[PDB]
């Protein structure tokens, strides 16, 4: 609780069109999914995220993480509400949405250049580096959770699952399957799992493809690593065509980082410091 604003529930209900759960593109306030709503408070646009006792301690858990973790490449928590029998968290609004939607060019946005993509990748790595340095594991690293501010600065978001480290195991396996390391899928909690997930992200950046596509072969993006290793295909075959500034050398350099991140065995993966350095040298 490092000087966050305490909101009453009615204030946030007011500014969100009464928590209008319809997508924004269809006239509502939902920008994603608790559920996350767009709101206008005090000349500012904000992001409002809306067992009883156990939801309360997760609510308290995230505030704890957000109090301790402040960084240019992390979404900043602005405040909260806990009086309308319905818990809310209020964050800095990121106008350019998620990396996922920018890679897909959702709603007709311009394809991201290779230069911008490298900057976002570096930003994301810097954000993850801060978390690991400060002994946190994100647990849900993915392109939908890399948000983009006014200047397309990468902002790591959705810390609802984040855990402090001192490898432990959990009974409640959480995360996004198409991004999850094998050990994470088996209930292990380790920062090495974040690295693996970041490798999938790097693949999405290179290819512009989503991590999963039920009508695609392979359905999982991470499987393209094996197709390339068993030289059936090249990374060149998979490079996003919606760029004109992607030189072979840096693309191959990024793929090399991605491939190392995606080692099936957690101990053979680079840590975030090495990932940071490698993305620097690519540039």
**Strand composition percent:** 5-15%
The tally of structural domains comes to 2
Number of helical regions = 10
CATH class of the largest domain: Mainly Alpha
- What is the H/E order? EHEEEHEEHHEEEEEHEHHHHH
Catalytic activity: L-seryl-[protein] + ATP = O-phospho-L-seryl-[protein] + ADP + H(+); L-threonyl-[protein] + ATP = O-phospho-L-threonyl-[protein] + ADP + H(+)
Active site: 140 (proton acceptor)
Binding site for ATP: 31-36, 49, 142-145, 158
Keywords: Acetylation, ATP-binding, Cytoplasm, Disease variant, Immunity, Innate immunity, Kinase, Magnesium, Nucleotide-binding, Phosphoprotein, Serine/threonine-protein kinase, Transferase
Describe this structure in words.
With 283 residues, the protein is α+β, with helices and mostly antiparallel strands. It has 2 domains: 93 residues, Phosphorylase Kinase, domain 1, CATH 3.30.200; 190 residues, Transferase(Phosphotransferase) domain 1 (Transferase(Phosphotransferase), domain 1, Orthogonal Bundle). It is built from 10 helices and 12 strands. A 6-stranded mixed β-sheet has the order 1-5-6-4-3-2. Strand 2 and strand 3 form a beta hairpin. Helix 9 packs antiparallel against helix 10. The longest helix has 20 residues. It starts with a strand and ends with a helix. Keywords: Acetylation, ATP-binding, Cytoplasm, Disease variant, Immunity, Innate immunity, Kinase, Magnesium, Nucleotide-binding, Phosphoprotein, Serine/threonine-protein kinase, Transferase. GO terms for molecular function: ATP binding; interleukin-1 receptor binding; kinase activity; magnesium ion binding; protein kinase binding; protein serine kinase activity; protein serine/threonine kinase activity. Its EC number is 2.7.11.1. This is Interleukin-1 receptor-associated kinase 4. It catalyses: L-seryl-[protein] + ATP = O-phospho-L-seryl-[protein] + ADP + H(+); L-threonyl-[protein] + ATP = O-phospho-L-threonyl-[protein] + ADP + H(+).
